[PDB]
Design a binder for these strands. Structure first.
Ligand code: SF4
Lengths: 457, 43, 120
DNA sequence: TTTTTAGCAGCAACA
DNA sequence: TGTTGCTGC
């Protein structure tokens, strides 16, 4: 990334007139913050440190993910930006992992400092007869499009670090320790350390004295044509066993297998794997009932995916997600809504509660109740029949204890949508096309039903 | 490429709602003596 | 001058181009185009409430606002800036301008006025 | 969502 | 003392 490293150095040299009073209203860069983004382990932090030191700045690093007290940190950042350090050298602030700050405190403080400096500069330019930012700020993220950074981006100079720099650093350490290491062995050490700089330096020191579950899932669908299938199988078995998280690996395999290319005859391969997956579910249920002796067999089920679906065609890494946690939380929320409706029926309908099972309520009663509420009353020309149906629907809303709430969360005084509480809609409406049609019809019906409920009150 | 069928249904529904309002207006107009006169054919 | 130059009735000796004066009046901010651009760049670093209702995204950037809303926010900060730097919010100026009234152009507007005047 | 224009008096605040 | 707002000409 030499071009990127020269751009960073060029941006830090634009601070030189303001900080060092050297000749290349304060001639500062238009963008006062440098924002570095890119993959982990490529040296973002190391490049920020080296270029800041090379430019004559003292480097102060803050991890933004660990500092869960922006309002307090505030004092640290204000001292580091505006107070003279005892060091002869001006401070450069390096903020690492700024995308990890779940609490916008750190970013709000930086935005407040930038806005205060813009107000102070405009007063110096236009003010007829306020702490100015005299120090550079470097911020490092993994993700540029993180919601927290949206307010900071306009003040930032954005620099992408793409995927050598570790090899150059390790060579410089070898040369300073008088170690004659062949460049091949340093590459093999980098590959062993997976780009961990700390692990690399420790392994080098030891020489001188003398698998993410996702990566395993993608490896389970890959066959190398140049290695024995048995050696690959034992290597994968050892990696699955060392990880101890066989369940997450299998859930990964389950989400990936439909998208994987596998020579297909009749999609039987999937039928054989449903029986294993069922075997895993029985084994996982038995782990809570019996002392975990059965845990040794849990590593075998992921390896059936390597045997059945492993192909040379699968060269690209498929990214994955956790639909199950979202489905479990949604199933919990829907079960809680249904449990609340069942309690409401028990309090009002003395007999209905005896005939209503949870399943019959979800599949039979609630879909019909919603179809009755969503029915187009605008097609009914007979006012008497419209009034009678509306009186029966008000009686049904009362039997199920369904409250019409005016959600006034619109915010702009136009059409506060009426919503049913509890929201039966989230339990019954499975089809996204039907959701939009039903919402438009319901809005006119619910206003008529609310007016009738108010008339009855 | 995923909504071309849901716009046609709403326009037929709106045209049917407008015809139903026009029928109610024809009923009210006739109550108030405004029967819909159609003139004789003249060639 | 363009549409008059494109017209085949535009000869040497033309009588049909009646020139008449009018007094234009601007009210403008004392602030210049560099100061306007400085206020625009300052507003691009601010965040704005979505006039959205049953909608969701509660917050917009400046460039995600409608151009009319962008100019409403610009005019607000320019009123404060102009008052702070120039001690006035507005300048007003009157400029005498000239325009060409075609006499050969299709008479439908003026015929409506003449005819309406005569019927009255 | 429908929608003529500019010039002026004068009370009251604030630049 | 002047400008600026608002209502109502
Ligand atoms: S009719 Fe008007 S536009 Fe045409 S030549 Fe004459 S002045 Fe020009």
């Amino acid at each position: 990334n030499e071009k990127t490293n020269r751009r960073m150095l060029g941006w830090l040299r634009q601070w030189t007139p303001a900080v060092f009073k050297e000749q290349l209203p304060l001639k500062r860069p238009p963008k006062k913050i440098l924002l570095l983004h890119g993959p982990p382990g490529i040296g973002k932090t190391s490049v920020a440190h080296v270029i800041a030191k090379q430019s004559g700045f003292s480097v102060s690093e803050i991890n933004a993910s660990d500092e869960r007290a922006g309002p307090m940190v505030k004092e640290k950042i204000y001292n580091l930006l505006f107070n003279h350090t005892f060091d002869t050298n001006p401070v450069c602030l390096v903020a690492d992992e700024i995308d990890g700050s779940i609490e916008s405190g750190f970013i709000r403080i930086l935005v407040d400092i930038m806005q205060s400096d813009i107000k102070a500069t405009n007063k110096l330019l236009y003010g007829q007869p306020s702490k100015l930012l005299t120090r550079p700020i470097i911020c490092i993220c993994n993700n540029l499009y993180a919601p927290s950074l949206e307010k900071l981006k306009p003040f930032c100079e954005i620099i992408a670090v793409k995927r050598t720099t570790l090899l150059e650093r390790l060579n410089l350490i070898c040369h300073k320790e008088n170690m004659n290491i062949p460049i091949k062995a340093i590459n093999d050490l980098i590959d062993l350390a997976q780009g961990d700089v700390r692990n690399c330096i420790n392994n080098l020191q030891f020489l001188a004295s003398n698998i993410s579950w996702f990566k395993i899932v993608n490896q389970l669908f890959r066959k190398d044509p140049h290695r024995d299938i048995k050696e690959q199988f034992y290597e994968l078995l050892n990696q699955v066993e060392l990880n101890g998280n066989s369940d997450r690996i299998l859930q990964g395999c389950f989400n990936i297998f439909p998208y994987v290319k596998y020579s297909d005859n009749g999609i039987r391969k999937p039928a054989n794997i449903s029986d294993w997956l069922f075997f895993h579910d029985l084994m996982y249920q038995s782990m809570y009932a019996h002392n975990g002796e059965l845990l040794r067999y849990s590593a075998l089920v992921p390896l059936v995916f390597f045997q059945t679906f492993g192909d040379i065609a699968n060269k690209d890494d498929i990214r994955m997600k956790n639909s199950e946690y979202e489905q479990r939380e949604l199933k919990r929320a829907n079960s809680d809504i249904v449990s609340l409706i069942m309690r409401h029926i028990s309090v009002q309908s003395p007999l209905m509660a005896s005939f209503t099972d949870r399943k019959s309520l979800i599949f039979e009663i609630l879909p019909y109740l919603d179809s009755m509420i969503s029915s187009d009353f605008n097609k009914i020309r007979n006012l008497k029949l419209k009034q009678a149906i509306m009186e029966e629907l008000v009686q049904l809303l009362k039997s199920f204890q369904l409250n019409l709430i005016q959600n006034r969360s619109e915010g702009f005084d136009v059409r506060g949508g009426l919503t049913i509480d509890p929201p039966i809609d989230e339990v019954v409406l499975l089809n996204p096309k039907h959701i939009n049609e039903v919402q438009h019809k319901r809005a006119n019906n619910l206003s008529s039903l609310l007016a009738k409920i108010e008339e009855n009150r | 490429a995923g909504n071309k069928y849901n716009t046609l249904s709403n326009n037929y529904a709106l045209s049917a709602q407008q015809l139903l309002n026009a029928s109610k207006i024809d009923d009210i107009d006739s109550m108030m003596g405004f029967e819909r006169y159609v003139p004789p054919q003249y060639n | 001058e363009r549409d008059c130059a494109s017209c085949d009735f535009n000869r040497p000796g033309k009588t049909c181009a009646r020139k008449l004066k009018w007094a234009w009046r601007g009210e403008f901010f004392p602030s210049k185009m560099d100061e306007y651009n400085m206020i625009k760049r300052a507003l691009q670093n601010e965040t704005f409430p979505n006039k959205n209702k049953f909608s969701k995204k509660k917050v917009l950037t400046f460039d995600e606002l409608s151009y009319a809303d962008q100019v409403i926010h610009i005019k607000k900060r320019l009123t404060e800036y102009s008052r702070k730097v120039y001690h006035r919010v507005k300048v007003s100026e009157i400029v005498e301008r000239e325009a060409i009234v075609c006499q050969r152009e299709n008479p439908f507007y003026v015929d409506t006025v003449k005819s309406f005047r005569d019927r009255r």
